[model samples]
Target: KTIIINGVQFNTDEDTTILKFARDNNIDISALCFLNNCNNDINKCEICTVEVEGTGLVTACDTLIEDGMIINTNSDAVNEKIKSRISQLLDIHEFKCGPCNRRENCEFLKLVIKYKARASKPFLPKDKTEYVDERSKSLTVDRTKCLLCGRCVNACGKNTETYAMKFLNKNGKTIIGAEDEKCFDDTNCLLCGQCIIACPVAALSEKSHMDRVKNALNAPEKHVIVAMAPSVRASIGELFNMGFGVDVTGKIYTALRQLGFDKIFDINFGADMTIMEEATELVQRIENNGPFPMFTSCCPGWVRQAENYYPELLNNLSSAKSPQQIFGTASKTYYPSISGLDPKNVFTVTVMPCTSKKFEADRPQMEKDGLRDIDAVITTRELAKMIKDAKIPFAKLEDSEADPAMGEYSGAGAIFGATGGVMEAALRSAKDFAENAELEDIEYKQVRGLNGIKEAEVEINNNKYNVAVINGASNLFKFMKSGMINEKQYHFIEVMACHGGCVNGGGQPHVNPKDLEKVDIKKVRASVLYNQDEHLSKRKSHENTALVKMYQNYFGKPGEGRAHEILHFKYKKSAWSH
Candidate 1:
């Protein structure tokens, strides 16, 4: 149907939301929860209301577009109505942007600013009782800031398929919490923390370890080593008030150096190491007939989810430790040996866009060399806070290089933070490992992007290998369930607990779901990482000189005994009964 919104004509399908139709045609319309091409139910928020010819004011997200329909989106009258409604909602909301970690990038906060809302007239419940759910080791749910938008609930049930949280009560008494008041650790919760990212407000947050990190850094005798995950380069800029998905690797390295870290390393180096071990293990399993469908263990969230929901499939999980653990272990052991620093004096800190990494760090197996592999785990949010606390101008800072030896990485390593990144990186190495040949183009565009589930088949050395990638725990459940019932489907699987992978992880920058609907955050972030990948001279993980040297000089080869002991781990059954 042809419709005129504002001053532009758009050919839109019938029954499409007015907001979506306008957005598809590049018409600027401010909306909270209305997303283009998303099956998002519009009942959760009423911020997308627009005026019709005679139908008064109706939500553009719920109202369908028709041929010759004249929609008034930006009329002064409509703007006033939206401003009034938003002001009213703010009156009842426990709005506090001062201590909010998402102060710079919050969508709801932007709306408040755009509408010029000064103060809520009739102040509603300033409910001082903050609901704290520390059940999950990684995430903390504070009910005071919850807007009750239901995005987290939807993401938990529909996106991650964990079904760990749900909305309870009615009308004015509505709130979100776990079913049966069970702790997140007791429930089937995977500690994925996607709900924290999905929350429009500060209701969900990562358990902060900033104090511990600061204490360690300030210690004179201790040498603090900081490492950044692959996705962090693509997504951390948003926290420092920069554009979403900007590659701030150089800036990040500079910031850490200025912050007095003894050494700054790239977790991508470990990601390269991971591919060497994981690919080798996959081939060995295929030959030995051990595990039919081997799962990638790069994402700690996916690892915890498997422990809770699919303990039976534990054997199928690759034993390789995540890049964070691999880097941390090496920093305390191998790096110290090379640098001649005492193991006890080396404090290994990991900067990740994932809260699950915090949980993963505390895992019993992650400790080696007479101390914990990772001394501290700080989320992307925490890193931003640290930067802000240090008064560093991140966006304006000069681009710098990471530390030599462990900090060197390739494009394949840079992409490891996003969904399908591990699979793509693994494929790059596997293609050469299996065929003993060099790949012309390393970009696996087919499996890339923020799709819930993606599948592809590639033949290397006359062997057809079927692979599947699932991002977001809820989506992983559907893919696994379908494959379990179908039989003889995927030979390999890559599952990441956060949507769009680690770039949009719960521990990354917190973007309101409302704004996320309007912005292609995953795409923007992925684009930055891809650009970094394209600029790099080395695109293959195996080609990373430091990783190659480490394998040759120290670990012997991938899947070797020494590598397995330090870089591999086993999963355990969680407290959840099914």
Candidate 2:
């Protein structure tokens, strides 16, 4: 097959869209409503319009190429069509970039500047109070900034298959929102924030927790402790103009210290703690010879999915609290006991690569004696904004270590950000506990990578058990609904809401569509974690010295006594209908 793009003849046998072919040949074509190999099928944004000989104008994103097809992407008519679409989008857009959260990397703003487009009837409103919806703990919506692009809708459908995000009619005007324009928290929505990552503008954002952190810092009576998730170190460097997948762990600690955080801790410590309890539970279930499949409950998005769609699996979920919540619980009780501080004054905060964590922290059951396990939850992007707001030099700062108390972690904890990490980490400890021997082989390579569903069989004490790793929310549905779970006698399972795990979470650094095509963002980020694990002396969770001391001196055992009483939680089926 032969195709001529911009008068340059190229011969190819590959079947692909014109946009993809042009990009492959170094010919740039602008696009907005196209992502995840899909476009806004109902309402196409013709920004990728191109002139094809004898066929008039067509969108390059969804149009296929044929033999002897001539394409002109920079024609006068094509330019007018693209510019006209931008102008129309601007008519509905707020166009106030100064205060917008996405002012730095907004795709819509870039298009407006490139095309020199202006709205004929400016959309300057007297007030945006009515257009804003901040009811959800995990997400927020600004209708004024929305372009009706349907990127969020498409992303939610592709990532979660929940269709939690949808296009609806209100006052006879079509708009994108949750079911019946209700609060997302009230619906079957997982609050995963995939939609926020997909939006081209500032329309969708994580609900702000900056004020909560700031208020806690300002209170003289409060002792604010800050901790960050494993993925933050690998992903936050992108916001500082550093290349992606750079390990900024030490820099993050220094920046947090400079920002006035009382203690800079690592959620990797909490990850180790989770492994201890989860591995113990796995061993216990094996001895009991029942339950059959125990699911990991680290991801709040997956927890919500089980609660909303698969209520029968509620009992199958592991009772271990997530790393963030477990750490928060210890911060209040163990930290206060050792430091001789009042428990009420201890305010715990966690930095995560997830938006659902905010909702998890706010859950009513995640409290003891009126003190919430976690007082505040901030995403990786929010922490970056905070560093910039404080004028801290993130890229040039000297490296600093986190506080030794409750901060030291093993390599098993370091890999928790990637898919199948929890399963591998648990196997390292569970095999050791069940066999009563120190195992040298810790890496379970079969359970790794970006595959939607991964399965592995292991022999523990001469009894072979099956394990599976479900990579994303959509894949979780497919595993259960497609009868894959019933086809095998699985003993343990791990599920993460994001496809590539927290490394590519909804709240991580947002990559432009062009860069996304060029970079293996998930692989690069996961490699940083695997490298950390490779070099660290302590590879298994049980070998973490601080965690072992914590267990011996404070909590009795891994899955019994004080550990289960304070650091575990369970979910029940919700009465709400999906």
Candidate with top lDDT is: 2
Task: State residue 149's C-alpha deviation in candidate 1, in Å.
Answer: 2.0
The global C-alpha lDDT for each of the candidates, from Candidate 1 onward, is 0.78, 0.93
Model 1: per-residue lDDT, tens digit, 1-578?
Answer: 78767766777565767877776666766766543233347344667777777677778866778787777887888888878867866765667678777676677778888888755664445445445666666778777566666777776776566678787773557778777666676677777777776676677888888877889888999999898887788888876667676678789999999888988888888888888888888777767866767888878777777877778878788888788887887887788768889889988888988887888888766787478988888888889889888898998899888887898988888888778889988888887887789979777788987788788887766888788888778787787677642555567789888778787777877665445666798888878877878999999988998888887877777887788877888775555665
In candidate 2, stretches whose alpha carbon ends up further than 4 angstroms from where it belongs are 574-578
The RMSD of every model to the true structure, in order and in angstroms, is 3.8, 1.4
- Can you give the lDDT of residue 360 in candidate 1? 82
Global CA lDDT of candidate 2, please? 0.93
Candidate 1 clash figure, as a count: 5
List of clashing residue pairs for candidate 1: 32-514, 159-474, 160-473, 160-474, 161-474
Give the clash count for each candidate. Answer: 5, 0
User: What TM-score does prediction 2 earn?
Assistant: 0.98
TM-score for every candidate vs. truth?
0.86, 0.98
